[PDB]
Amino acid sequence: SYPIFTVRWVAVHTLAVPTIFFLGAIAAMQFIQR
Amino acid sequence: ATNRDQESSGFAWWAGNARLINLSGKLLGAHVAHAGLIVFWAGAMTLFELAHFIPEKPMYEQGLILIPHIATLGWGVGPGGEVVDTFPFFVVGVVHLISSAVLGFGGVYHAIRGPETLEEYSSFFGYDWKDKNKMTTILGFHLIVLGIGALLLVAKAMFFGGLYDTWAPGGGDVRVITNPTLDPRVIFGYLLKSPFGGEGWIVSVNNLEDVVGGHIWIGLICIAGGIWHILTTPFGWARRAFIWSGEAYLSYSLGALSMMGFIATCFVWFNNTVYPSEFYGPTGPEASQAQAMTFLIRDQKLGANVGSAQGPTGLGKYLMRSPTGEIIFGGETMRFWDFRGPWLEPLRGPNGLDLNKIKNDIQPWQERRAAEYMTHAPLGSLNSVGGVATEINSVNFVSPRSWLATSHFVLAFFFLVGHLWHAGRARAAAAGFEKGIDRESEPVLSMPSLD
Amino acid sequence: ERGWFDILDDWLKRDRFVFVGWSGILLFPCAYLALGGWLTGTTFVTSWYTHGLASSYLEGCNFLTVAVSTPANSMGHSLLLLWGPEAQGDFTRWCQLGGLWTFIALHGAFGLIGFMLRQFEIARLVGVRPYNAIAFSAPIAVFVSVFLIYPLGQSSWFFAPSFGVAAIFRFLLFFQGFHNWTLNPFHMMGVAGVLGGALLCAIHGATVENTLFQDGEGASTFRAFNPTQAEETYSMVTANRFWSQIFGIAFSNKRWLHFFMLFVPVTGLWMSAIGVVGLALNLRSYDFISQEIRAAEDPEFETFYTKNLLLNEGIRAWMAPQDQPHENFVFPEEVLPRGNAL
Amino acid sequence: TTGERPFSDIITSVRYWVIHSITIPALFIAGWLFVSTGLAYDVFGTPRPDSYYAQEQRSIPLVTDRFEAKQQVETFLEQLK
Amino acid sequence: AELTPEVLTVPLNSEGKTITLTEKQYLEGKRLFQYACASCHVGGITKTNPSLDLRTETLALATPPRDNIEGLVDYMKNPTTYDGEQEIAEVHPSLRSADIFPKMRNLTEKDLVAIAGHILVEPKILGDKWGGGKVYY
Amino acid sequence: ANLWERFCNWVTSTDNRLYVGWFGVIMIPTLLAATICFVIAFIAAPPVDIDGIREPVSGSLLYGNNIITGAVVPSSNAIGLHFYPIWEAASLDEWLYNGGPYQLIIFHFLLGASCYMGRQWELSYRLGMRPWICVAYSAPLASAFAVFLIYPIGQGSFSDGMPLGISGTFNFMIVFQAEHNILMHPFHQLGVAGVFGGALFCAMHGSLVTSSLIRETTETESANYGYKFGQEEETYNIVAAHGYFGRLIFQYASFNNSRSLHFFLAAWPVVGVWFAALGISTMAFNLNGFNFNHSVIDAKGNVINTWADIINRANLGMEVMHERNAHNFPLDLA
Numbered sequence A: 001s002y003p004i005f006t007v008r009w010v011a012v013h014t015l016a017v018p019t020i021f022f023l024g025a026i027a028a029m030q031f032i033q034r
Numbered sequence B: 001a002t003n004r005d006q007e008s009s010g011f012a013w014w015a016g017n018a019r020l021i022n023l024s025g026k027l028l029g030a031h032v033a034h035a036g037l038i039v040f041w042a043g044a045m046t047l048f049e050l051a052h053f054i055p056e057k058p059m060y061e062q063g064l065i066l067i068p069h070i071a072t073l074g075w076g077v078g079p080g081g082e083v084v085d086t087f088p089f090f091v092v093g094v095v096h097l098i099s100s101a102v103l104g105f106g107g108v109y110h111a112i113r114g115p116e117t118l119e120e121y122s123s124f125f126g127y128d129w130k131d132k133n134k135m136t137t138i139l140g141f142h143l144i145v146l147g148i149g150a151l152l153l154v155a156k157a158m159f160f161g162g163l164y165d166t167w168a169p170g171g172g173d174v175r176v177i178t179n180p181t182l183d184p185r186v187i188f189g190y191l192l193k194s195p196f197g198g199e200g201w202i203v204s205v206n207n208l209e210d211v212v213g214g215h216i217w218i219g220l221i222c223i224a225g226g227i228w229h230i231l232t233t234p235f236g237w238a239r240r241a242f243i244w245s246g247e248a249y250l251s252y253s254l255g256a257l258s259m260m261g262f263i264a265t266c267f268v269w270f271n272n273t274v275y276p277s278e279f280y281g282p283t284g285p286e287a288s289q290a291q292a293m294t295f296l297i298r299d300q301k302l303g304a305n306v307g308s309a310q311g312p313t314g315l316g317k318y319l320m321r322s323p324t325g326e327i328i329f330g331g332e333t334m335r336f337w338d339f340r341g342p343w344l345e346p347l348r349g350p351n352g353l354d355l356n357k358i359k360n361d362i363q364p365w366q367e368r369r370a371a372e373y374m375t376h377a378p379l380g381s382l383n384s385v386g387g388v389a390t391e392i393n394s395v396n397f398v399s400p401r402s403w404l405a406t407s408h409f410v411l412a413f414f415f416l417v418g419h420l421w422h423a424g425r426a427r428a429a430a431a432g433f434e435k436g437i438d439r440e441s442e443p444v445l446s447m448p449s450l451d
Numbered sequence C: 001e002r003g004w005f006d007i008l009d010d011w012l013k014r015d016r017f018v019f020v021g022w023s024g025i026l027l028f029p030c031a032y033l034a035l036g037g038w039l040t041g042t043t044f045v046t047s048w049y050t051h052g053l054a055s056s057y058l059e060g061c062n063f064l065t066v067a068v069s070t071p072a073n074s075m076g077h078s079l080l081l082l083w084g085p086e087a088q089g090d091f092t093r094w095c096q097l098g099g100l101w102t103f104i105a106l107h108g109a110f111g112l113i114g115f116m117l118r119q120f121e122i123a124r125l126v127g128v129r130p131y132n133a134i135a136f137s138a139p140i141a142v143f144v145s146v147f148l149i150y151p152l153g154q155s156s157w158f159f160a161p162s163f164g165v166a167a168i169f170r171f172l173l174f175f176q177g178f179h180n181w182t183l184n185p186f187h188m189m190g191v192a193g194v195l196g197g198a199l200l201c202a203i204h205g206a207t208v209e210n211t212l213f214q215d216g217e218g219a220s221t222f223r224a225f226n227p228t229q230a231e232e233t234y235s236m237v238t239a240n241r242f243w244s245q246i247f248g249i250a251f252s253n254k255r256w257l258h259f260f261m262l263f264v265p266v267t268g269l270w271m272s273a274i275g276v277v278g279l280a281l282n283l284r285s286y287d288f289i290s291q292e293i294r295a296a297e298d299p300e301f302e303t304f305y306t307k308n309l310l311l312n313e314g315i316r317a318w319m320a321p322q323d324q325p326h327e328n329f330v331f332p333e334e335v336l337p338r339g340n341a342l
Numbered sequence D: 001t002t003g004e005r006p007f008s009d010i011i012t013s014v015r016y017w018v019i020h021s022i023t024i025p026a027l028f029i030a031g032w033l034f035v036s037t038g039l040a041y042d043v044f045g046t047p048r049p050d051s052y053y054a055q056e057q058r059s060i061p062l063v064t065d066r067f068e069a070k071q072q073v074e075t076f077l078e079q080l081k
Numbered sequence E: 001a002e003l004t005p006e007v008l009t010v011p012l013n014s015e016g017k018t019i020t021l022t023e024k025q026y027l028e029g030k031r032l033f034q035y036a037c038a039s040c041h042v043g044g045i046t047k048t049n050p051s052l053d054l055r056t057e058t059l060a061l062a063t064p065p066r067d068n069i070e071g072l073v074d075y076m077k078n079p080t081t082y083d084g085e086q087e088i089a090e091v092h093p094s095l096r097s098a099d100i101f102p103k104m105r106n107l108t109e110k111d112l113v114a115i116a117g118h119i120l121v122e123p124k125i126l127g128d129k130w131g132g133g134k135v136y137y
Numbered sequence F: 001a002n003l004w005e006r007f008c009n010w011v012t013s014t015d016n017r018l019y020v021g022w023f024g025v026i027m028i029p030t031l032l033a034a035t036i037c038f039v040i041a042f043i044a045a046p047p048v049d050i051d052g053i054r055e056p057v058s059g060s061l062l063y064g065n066n067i068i069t070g071a072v073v074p075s076s077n078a079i080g081l082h083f084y085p086i087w088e089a090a091s092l093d094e095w096l097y098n099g100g101p102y103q104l105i106i107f108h109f110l111l112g113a114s115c116y117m118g119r120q121w122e123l124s125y126r127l128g129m130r131p132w133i134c135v136a137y138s139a140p141l142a143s144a145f146a147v148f149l150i151y152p153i154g155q156g157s158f159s160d161g162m163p164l165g166i167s168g169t170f171n172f173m174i175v176f177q178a179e180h181n182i183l184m185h186p187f188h189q190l191g192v193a194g195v196f197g198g199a200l201f202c203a204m205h206g207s208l209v210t211s212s213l214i215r216e217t218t219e220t221e222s223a224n225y226g227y228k229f230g231q232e233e234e235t236y237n238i239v240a241a242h243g244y245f246g247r248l249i250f251q252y253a254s255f256n257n258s259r260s261l262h263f264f265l266a267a268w269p270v271v272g273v274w275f276a277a278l279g280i281s282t283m284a285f286n287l288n289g290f291n292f293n294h295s296v297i298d299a300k301g302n303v304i305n306t307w308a309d310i311i312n313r314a315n316l317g318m319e320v321m322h323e324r325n326a327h328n329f330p331l332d333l334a
């Protein structure tokens, strides 16, 4: 009934895809020791 | 699902607990379940404090707020406030934790299993908010309970080991209170003191005899009034002054709690008798006076005549006169000359600080105590870096007096907002316009214009 | 004529979950890049070579202390294009030299233009008057005056605000110490507009909510409103009588009331922007000459004005060596201004 | 409504979660590895804890020229032994 | 820059013998210094008497010299005034006065060495910041 | 109709041009007293020894101040938190030297303004209104208590209360930053969100309602004449406003219920200013902003400065210079 790939789909993923990658990068930083 | 949606009850989910107003049985459960939460926290937090407690560190260096309450009552501590036995702290924690399961059990039962309303089930436990006789009777029972509670503190002080007395000769110790103050001129004279500097209203109580005798008076008063309110019903003048409804009664209590929270804020901030500095750290006034004492001692040891040292402003560098003549510490701490503490009073004469005692009678334990309190002033950051806002990281410290005073100001403030919210709503609901203005009966349309 | 331009126009203006429009060709890349640059920079990029500061989660900063910092003072007002003569196409050097700051500020400027074109574009399609776009001129005037004009009057981008929480706090304190910005009547007007705007926001909302008509039976009054109803949902007449008798004066025209709510904060922000334009040239309201002449000659004359200048003097001397490392200030202990004891 | 499938429809559909139970952790782990391999340091030019200063120096490697700024940073980076 | 054995090498006594601490000793010294000393000595100053700091140059001119491990360990057992003339255990924390300074009751000899080591290494790291006060914050 | 019932009916009458009411019976005399003392003191009061060090600060117009530098100066640090009414002074000249007027103004003002809040409740009850306008006023009122009463209590002196003047306010703010790092306190940050947000939503609501006014006038007249006081029908199209703002963002980020929209307008600034007031009130007991001074350390142990450390440098400059003759000992503990 509904399409899958719309403008809203692109807008959602340009934000959500880097967010998750950044959250993993920042999670790893909590174990860096000087 | 009796009254468990917005259509049946009229209250949306975010005001869902308002659906309980006329469901005394579920309302009983909510109250009992919640008291279990209070008793749970008391039990659990004590155990957490105990597990994290090192007896060689001062309590106030360890983030403790509950163990200091227990130690003040005389359990676990000896001379100087040194911890001699942590088992009482353990007992207090365990018993509160175990009791919360009993309360949680009853709360959950009444909330979801028992009768939703109690009026059909029992007329003794049933009540109607508008029944002025039943409401004052329930009030009377709880006054008798509170009165017994105040008498338990007297029993501990007079018969079961006593209380920790920061003022006791020889550095502070547990002491049995044998002659509590009963003179009503003393006890009620505290109530008529100004709340301003040098007076301090009831926050100024500074000896355990007054503390204990005040609780004797409070115990009798609560028991008597409790019997009074069981046997009587509100008088005609009282009937006309109040709103008689559940929300109204809530709003009055919210006002009362807000007032008590503000008083407790000032108590922990200024009083060092029922909040001994050995357990809670110095007061703000105390640490500021202690700095002046520390440098007076240092400089006098180097050969300064501190009585005659003129500071840059022309006022004494170490000592000056208060606006009424008393000899007091100089510098910015001139504002704190109302401070009284056991480490300072041996230097006090009839005219205030006595220069001969300062020159000759300062004992090493006083220098120790002043350096300790000066370096544990109640200043520190939200992430618990101790000291002035410009200090570097190193010292993990925020005084218990700051934690207890800030938390209870915030709570008291919101409880005042709650009083205004619910008192204003109670009034509007009683009169019938808490849902808005009737279009066909808009009161302003029947009033003469202003101009 | 239904050429490709008109077909493109059709697709851009489709009623979808996120409207696009012609303005969206400018708005969306520039907004996304400015936001992505700030998140990239605050997560991974240092300020060590431009400021002597750590400024990223990677280095151990937290949400309050991360920033994308301004470039080094030696860059002047360089555009700092990735392909320009400073970075020379080297992405890593570009980051180390402060290229992300101009990247964010410039894409942000064009993003803001794009947002305001979007307000015009949508307003014209729906058929409303474009007052929302007009009100948005005030955030744009602030952004352009603080982030672009102010550093362009100064020696370099370095003295622009850096993009971070604590870095902005440093910017507030720099403006007190060096510009005496609290004394500036253009700032004062901006304060009045912001605080008066918040005041109007609170009072209008509370007044509506407490003069509601009973249009339903539930104790939650929110349900008793229908977006297409013709009637006012609250009593303007009762509201007017309440404030007339509480305060002396009240609104009586609802169109004036809501124009005024537009007017007050928008005007305030515009006033503050003019003052910052003056600070670009150091054209400060720093002193009252009459106060200084008296205080120079009369060492017993003291006001809160002279007290605050002493604080500004402390700020300048104690923060300048670290805050301006390219100047190489060496201030021996003996020259630092300090009161007694502290 | 504007025609796209409702969000509540999508995020309660098994197929959404079949796909995203993989794509979400995969991205998280890529981000973690970007830091844990040390790649982030070298892409952006950010100092490691042991490379802010040389062992005995206490001066910042501050950039002071506009058009030789690139060489200045490279020179500062050499001097880390 | 790194915390190297060179940094961690400090005078053991006045005769010029050195001792090299481990990183674990240094970090233990830091934690114990914070536990027992920093309330008055944060950053190498002395809040209750700012005339005396913990700079090595100041410790060198104490009597007896305190710019080495043995001198500092002795100070924490039996502290004296700067000229050595008087014993100040009654007002300064020490092993001799662990009854009245209870935090000293659970310090062992090994701990005193680690605290001492922290005090001698920190100036090699921080330079003027150590003992310099707010001017160098 | 006895004389007490007559007086009560006049006091509570909804026909007075300005409502009096029982709160107004306390409000009117206390606000008059504070206002008259303030005006006289601002024009003509002699210098006041705010910090107790016999170093009087000039606050009034006749003693060399303009509108921007003038103030009613807080009472002396030597008084601390003692009550200092006129009758505790040996003379008016003593009372003026020691900052007597400050105490009289703020005590009467705080009483009057609390009664102003009660009066807002009281009139809503007489007119058949809902009662919570006074809850919104509690936010600015709590703030006045914070800087005039609570902060003096915690610091132990009314000499650290906010001065009653424009430059005096700035002095208070700067010293507050030095002593509590208020910028780094989340309650001040929530307060900034409250008033930045409140100003934003103010301009938002004003612009959207204005954008959707229903054409009722010609171009040569003010559109404000298109609304008539007391008219039954709404004057703008909220559906058109929602249709615009929903497309500006997305549909579900926009209000179409005027009641919940106006509730949001009330709540956002009021809640934010409550936090601001609680920030001042809890920093009165020295629970200060986040301290990240020297939080970032390199492998060797060198301090790596952050923007937080640059803020600390500015705070230090404020600290060492404020009240330059008032400190004899190294720590400014209150």
Ligand code: CLA
Residues within 6 Å of the ligand: B002, B003, B004, B005, B012, B013, B014, B015, B016, B017, B018, B019, B020, B023, B026, B027, B029, B030, B031, B033, B034, B101, B103, B104, B105, B108, B111, B112
């Ligand atoms: C202390 C906090 C507290 C307490 C004691 C209550 C209590 C109650 N709420 Mg309220 N409520 C609260 C907070 C609280 N609420 C909050 C924060 C909100 C906003 C979300 C609400 C919103 C709300 C609404 C909208 C409604 C209520 C209702 C009720 C009543 C019936 C609930 C029910 O039937 O659920 C049934 C739920 C279950 C059977 C699921 C599990 C519930 C049990 C009790 C969990 C207990 C777990 C515990 C660990 C077990 C310990 C056992 C051990 C002691 C032996 C009950 C008296 C209802 C009411 O008024 O009825 C007339 C109702 O409609 N509440």
Ligand code: CLA
Residues within 6 Å of the ligand: B013, B014, B015, B016, B017, B018, B250, B254, B414, B415, B416, B417, B418, B419, B421, B422, B425
């Ligand atoms: C003993 C105290 C007490 C009691 C028994 C009540 C009881 C009631 N209140 Mg009142 N109220 C109180 C104090 C109290 N209030 C205080 C102190 C305030 C000021 C804030 C209010 C302000 C208030 C308002 C504005 C309203 C009520 C309403 C009500 C009714 C519905 C409540 C409900 O279901 O909430 C449901 C509970 C929730 C929705 C949860 C709220 C979540 C809070 C905000 C989180 C707080 C953060 C937490 C402390 C820390 C963070 C936690 C996080 C990190 C996880 C109920 C009769 C409603 C009413 O008028 O009905 C007649 C209503 O509109 N109350």
Ligand code: CLA
Residues within 6 Å of the ligand: B045, B048, B049, B052, B062, B063, B064, B065, B382, B384, B400, B403, B404, B407, B410, B414, F271
């Ligand atoms: C009277 C309340 C009170 C007070 C004064 C203290 C005080 C303390 N606690 Mg305790 N504690 C409490 C309640 C309290 N706690 C409660 C309710 C719990 C269960 C959650 C705990 C569980 C607990 C643990 C597990 C620990 C402490 C610790 C401590 C110490 C350090 C505190 C800290 O670093 O905070 C950090 C500061 C914050 C987290 C700020 C909180 C901000 C809140 C969310 C704002 C809420 C505002 C308001 C309520 C909401 C209004 C909303 C509006 C819309 C109406 C300090 C002595 C520590 C310690 O040293 O133990 C020995 C520790 O480890 N506490």
Ligand code: CLA
Residues within 6 Å of the ligand: B028, B032, B102, B103, B105, B106, B107, B109, B110, B114, B115, B118, B121, B122, B125
């Ligand atoms: C203030 C709290 C409170 C109140 C007013 C009530 C009231 C009621 N309960 Mg509930 N209940 C409670 C708490 C409460 N309960 C708790 C804590 C539990 C778990 C133990 C229960 C578990 C419970 C069950 C399983 C049942 C009830 C029932 C009832 C109803 C009949 C009770 C009766 O006639 O006993 C007669 C009076 C006594 C037997 C005297 C008991 C004396 C106690 C046990 C000794 C301690 C007294 C002393 C004051 C305690 C101090 C506690 C304090 C330190 C906290 C009545 C409405 C019954 C019901 O709902 O019927 C449908 C029922 O079946 N309750």
Ligand code: CLA
Residues within 6 Å of the ligand: B136, B139, B143, B191, B192, B221, B222, B224, B225, B226, B228, B229, B232, B233, B234, B235, B238
């Ligand atoms: C929880 C405690 C509590 C509560 C809620 C009540 C509630 C009530 N009492 Mg009861 N009472 C109590 C405890 C309580 N009482 C105790 C312990 C005793 C024994 C001492 C009494 C003895 C008693 C008597 C003799 C009477 C009541 C009456 C009443 C009713 C009228 C209350 C009223 O008008 O107060 C309003 C308060 C006043 C009118 C006091 C004067 C107003 C002053 C100026 C306010 C001062 C405020 C100021 C801020 C004070 C600060 C502290 C101050 C001490 C310095 C009300 C139902 C009346 C009644 O109807 O009996 C059936 C009544 O005649 N009570």
Ligand code: HEC
Residues within 6 Å of the ligand: B371, B372, B375, E033, E036, E037, E038, E039, E040, E041, E046, E048, E049, E052, E053, E054, E055, E058, E059, E062, E066, E072, E075, E076, E080, E081, E082, E088, E092, E093, E115
């Ligand atoms: C405050 C209650 C203190 C605590 C806790 C610690 N020290 Fe201290 N220290 C303090 C003072 C007032 C002085 C001067 C004593 C004098 O009159 O000479 C000192 C001195 C020292 C020194 C000598 C420094 C010098 O330059 O000679 C040292 C080495 C020292 N203190 C070490 C030290 C240690 C290791 C501590 C924790 C176990 C410690 N101090 C705590 C005040 C206080």
Ligand SMILES: CC1=C(/C=C/C(C)=C/C=C/C(C)=C/C=C/C=C(C)/C=C/C=C(C)/C=C/C2=C(C)CCCC2(C)C)C(C)(C)CCC1
Residues within 6 Å of the ligand: B029, B030, B033, B034, B036, B037, B040, B094, B097, B098, B100, B101, B103, B104, B105, B107, B108, B111
């Ligand atoms: C109603 C309701 C509600 C509420 C509820 C509640 C609130 C409840 C409570 C509950 C509770 C309140 C509970 C409790 C419980 C408890 C318990 C269960 C305990 C146990 C204990 C133990 C087991 C112990 C142990 C130990 C010991 C003995 C020793 C030491 C160690 C230890 C700790 C291990 C809600 C909101 C959800 C909603 C719905 C409705």
Ligand SMILES: CC1=C(/C=C/C(C)=C/C=C/C(C)=C/C=C/C=C(C)/C=C/C=C(C)/C=C/C2=C(C)CCCC2(C)C)C(C)(C)CCC1
Residues within 6 Å of the ligand: B186, B187, B188, B190, B191, B202, B205, B210, B211, B212, B213, B214, B215, B217, B218, B241
């Ligand atoms: C314990 C103690 C003590 C004692 C105490 C006491 C003895 C107390 C008492 C107390 C009291 C005894 C209190 C009281 C209170 C009261 C109140 C708080 C009141 C209120 C009122 C009101 C609120 C009213 C209102 C109104 C009006 C006014 C009008 C009409 C209407 C109405 C009713 C609303 C001492 C200190 C010695 C010491 C320590 C301990």
Ligand SMILES: CC1=C(/C=C/C(C)=C/C=C/C(C)=C/C=C/C=C(C)/C=C/C=C(C)/C=C/C2=C(C)CCCC2(C)C)C(C)(C)CCC1
Residues within 6 Å of the ligand: A014, A015, A018, A019, A022, A023, C032, C033, C035, C036, C037, C038, C039, C040
């Ligand atoms: C720069 C640049 C660029 C770009 C980039 C980008 C575009 C990026 C993006 C990025 C991104 C896009 C990122 C993101 C991130 C995110 C994050 C990191 C988030 C986080 C979050 C959080 C953390 C949350 C929190 C919270 C809050 C806030 C509130 C609510 C609650 C909670 C707690 C949840 C390019 C290549 C073009 C070129 C070169 C330069």
Ligand SMILES: [Cl-]
Residues within 6 Å of the ligand: B330, B331, B332, B333, F326, F327, F328, F329
């Ligand atoms: Cl001082």
